[PDB]
Write a protein that binds this ligand. Structure first.
Ligand SMILES: [Zn+2]
Ligand SMILES: [Zn+2]
Ligand SMILES: [Zn+2]
Ligand SMILES: [Zn+2]
Lengths: 141, 141
């Protein structure tokens, strides 16, 4: 949480990149929210000021390096729970009702879909895998 | 193509529903495009006139009954290649460069992700599975 930035902070020294204060505050804000964050919410909270395109390029950096995931079906961002997995494709369980998002890791599923793609000549690079339905709390309500 | 509507036309009698001319023209337009269609493009072409919320409810009907899929990562619609599969979760290969979308069917992949979900208490209902990269034509260019 507060430590998580520090963990990401040395995942960047350890390769070409560096975590500017702006990237750290964006990362910290997303990690602290505990539901997926809309881009306009992140700007609001980073104004608690930086020009907006500065925060948007900090967000791009976080995404290209796999520290933040964009959830395509809700158009919202979440911090990667394990950050030095480089960039990676993983399933998310996204509750329809409370909007929580849980990040899994399945290499069998991603490998199967790669094989499916390559057997039709498609050269596959990043997969969007989002499972919808209800989390345990909401299903029990 | 022209026949495809007729095929969907009797997939609807065969259960509670009916394919109004408006739903048929929306379905026909999407099926004829051969790339994913944006909602505002569909309205343009259905104006070739109907009030827009009429076409948007025809689109909703098509989606709820599994005749049209919304691709979440490109915010665009495609006709289902095999329509009486009820509503279903299936992978799509979506080319990053030419934007073609190919609809597959994998019951192993969808079943695995259901099991993953249920083992954490999540009750899973519709999955978004979209594989990105380059189709064979674009990879060869
Ligand atoms: Zn991650
Ligand atoms: Zn929930
Ligand atoms: Zn389909
Ligand atoms: Zn292509």
């Amino acid at each position: 949480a507060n430590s998580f930035v520090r963990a990401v902070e040395r995942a960047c020294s350890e390769r070409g990149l560096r975590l500017t204060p702006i990237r750290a505050n964006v990362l910290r804000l997303i990690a602290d929210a505990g539901k997926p964050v809309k881009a306009y919410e992140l700007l609001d909270w980073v104004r608690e000021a930086d020009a907006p395109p500065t925060v948007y390029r900090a967000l791009d950096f976080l995404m290209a390096n796999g520290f933040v995931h964009k959830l395509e079906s809700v158009n919202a961002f979440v911090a990667c729970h394990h950050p030095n997995s480089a960039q990676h494709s993983v399933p998310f369980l996204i509750c329809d009702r409370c909007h929580s998002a849980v990040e899994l890791e399945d290499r069998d599923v991603v490998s199967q879909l790669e094989a499916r793609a390559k057997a039709l000549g498609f050269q596959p690079q990043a997969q969007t895998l989002e499972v919808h339905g209800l989390c345990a709390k909401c299903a029990a309500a």
